[PDB]
Amino acid sequence: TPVRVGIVGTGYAAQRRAEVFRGDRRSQLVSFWGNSEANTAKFADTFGVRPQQSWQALINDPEIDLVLIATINQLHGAIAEAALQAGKHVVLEYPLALTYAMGKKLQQLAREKGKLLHVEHIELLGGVHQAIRQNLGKIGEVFYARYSTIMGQNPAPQRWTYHHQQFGFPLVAALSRISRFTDLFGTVQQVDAQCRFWDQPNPEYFRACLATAYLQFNNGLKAEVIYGKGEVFHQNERIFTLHGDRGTLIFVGETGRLIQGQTETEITVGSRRGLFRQDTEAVLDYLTTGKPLYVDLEASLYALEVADLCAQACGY
Ligand SMILES: NC(=O)c1ccc[n+]([C@@H]2O[C@H](COP(=O)([O-])OP(=O)(O)OC[C@H]3O[C@@H](n4cnc5c(N)ncnc54)[C@H](OP(=O)(O)O)[C@@H]3O)[C@@H](O)[C@H]2O)c1
Ligand SMILES: C=CC1=C(C)/C(=C/c2[nH]c(/C=C3N=C(/C=C4\NC(=O)C(C)=C4C=C)C(C)=C\3CCC(=O)O)c(CCC(=O)O)c2C)NC1=O
Ligand SMILES: C=CC1=C(C)/C(=C/c2[nH]c(/C=C3N=C(/C=C4\NC(=O)C(C)=C4C=C)C(C)=C\3CCC(=O)O)c(CCC(=O)O)c2C)NC1=O
């Protein structure tokens, strides 16, 4: 300490990190690596840091102790691996990797190098998920559950989140959909999935995708995971429904209600706080005082495992 940080990426997540790292006594933002020249210059000017020429040069820099990986999904695996070999602590924005196999390597590698390997999961710090668990008890045995997120976007940009290789399998990239269910109900017994893309004229990109996963949990629960975004969607949704034999929990965006006997009581849901700030501090609290992190790497790797299985169910 101060934990000297190099940041890989200059996007939204990378900026929230820079803000907290800088403003936090225990940490020192040292370097960063980006992509486009404009945003590498914006990031450098905004935060007072100079950019490495390559991410390889960033992770080998002896004057950083921790690599923060907030770049495109496709690069998570190789960069996390190179940084662990180079003896750095590695914090990643999810997904850990684009395949379950690669994530297992990183876990094993980080173990045998004695370095922190943490995957951020801000969906587990949000109002919806905390309210779901504040209230899970009073709806009995959850037998039927669905989480639909539909993000219509017309036109679809030819940015990295619509690129097959850089984004990866959509349910691997949108790991927070499955992660929620595994955090609440544990091991999945059975996996069925379908994915369908609408290509761009340049088919490296897609203008839309619909990914559906049908999960059967060991404890009897049936769960539906619906992820869709792009040009063919005309109605947005962010709906989490949980049917128990004692009641129903429904969360529509950030509003929640408990439903018992065909009647509903409103549920208070927490503010859209700096979830990135919570995570950053959780990392700095763990590295200094040993306070356990709010999510385990094991749980993150398990979410990827279920998601990787969804990618096999789709032939992908
Ligand atoms: N709330 C969140 O945003 C959120 C939450 C959870 C996890 N994550 C994880 O965030 C990582 C960062 O995502 P984001 O949401 O911050 O996206 P973003 O704002 O688009 O930032 C991505 C960074 O992408 C770099 N980049 C883009 N294309 C690249 C390429 N082809 N090769 C190398 N670098 C490239 C961007 O380049 P330019 O300089 O060209 O912009 C910039 O440096 C992903 O794992 C994302 O899923 C994000
Ligand atoms: C408007 C553009 C916008 C972009 C480009 C964006 C990127 C983005 N947001 C994500 C999750 C998330 N993104 C946010 C919040 C934000 N993220 C933001 O970029 C911004 C500006 C906010 C909020 C003002 C949250 C809370 C999650 C967690 C979602 C969850 O709980 O599942 C993810 C991870 C993959 C996924 O779950 O789909 C990405 C790539 N989010 C956006 O809202
Ligand atoms: C042009 C606006 C706008 C867009 C394009 C948008 C889309 C959007 N919201 C996302 C996550 C998210 N973004 C937010 C929240 C916000 N997001 C915000 O832009 C703001 C101000 C909040 C404020 C709370 C949330 C809650 C998610 C949750 C996960 C989801 O809905 O998929 C993602 C995930 C990553 C991806 O696959 O690209 C996208 C595209 N939301 C938008 O509001």
Author numbering: 9 to 324
Sentences copied from the publication:
In this study, we used a cyanobacterial BVR from Synechocystis sp. PCC 6803 (Syn BVR)13 as a target for the structural analyses. BVR catalyses the reduction of the C10 double bond (γ-methene bridge) of BV using NAD(P)H to produce BR, a reaction in which the hydride (H−: a proton and two electrons) is donated by NAD(P)H. Syn BVR is composed of 328 residues and shares more than 20% sequence identity with rat and human BVR proteins. Syn BVR consists of two structural domains (N-terminal and C-terminal domains), with the active sites in an obvious cleft between them.
We successfully obtained BV-bound BVR crystals by the co-crystallization screening, and the resulting crystals were a bluish-green colour. The BV-bound crystals belong to a different space group (P21) than those of the apo- and NADP+ soaked forms (P212121), and the asymmetric unit contains four BVR molecules (A to D molecules). Surprisingly, two BV molecules are bound to the catalytic cleft between the two domains, and adopt a stacked configuration along with the tetrapyrrole plane. NADP+ molecules were also bound by all four BVR molecules, although we did not add the NADP+ reagent during the purification and crystallization procedures. The configuration of NADP+ in the ternary complex was identical to that in the NADP+-soaking crystal. One BV (the proximal BV) was bound in close vicinity of the nicotinamide ring, and the other one (the distal BV) was located on the upper stack with the proximal BV. The C10 double bond in the proximal BV, which is to be reduced, faces the nicotinamide C4 carbon (origin of the hydride) of the NADP+; the distance between the C10 carbon of the proximal BV and the C4 carbon of the NADP+ is 2.6 Å, and the angle between the C10 and nicotinamide ring was ∼120°. This configuration of the proximal BV appears suitable to accept the hydride from the nicotinamide ring, and strongly suggests that the hydride is directly transferred to the C10 carbon in the proximal BV. The distal BV is located ∼4 Å above, translated by ∼2.5 Å to the solvent side and rotated ∼45° relative to the proximal BV. Instead, the guanidine group of Arg185 formed hydrogen bonds with the carboxy group of the propionate side chain of the proximal BV (within 2.8 Å in all molecules of the asymmetric unit); thus, the Arg185 must first donate its proton to the propionate side chain of the proximal BV.
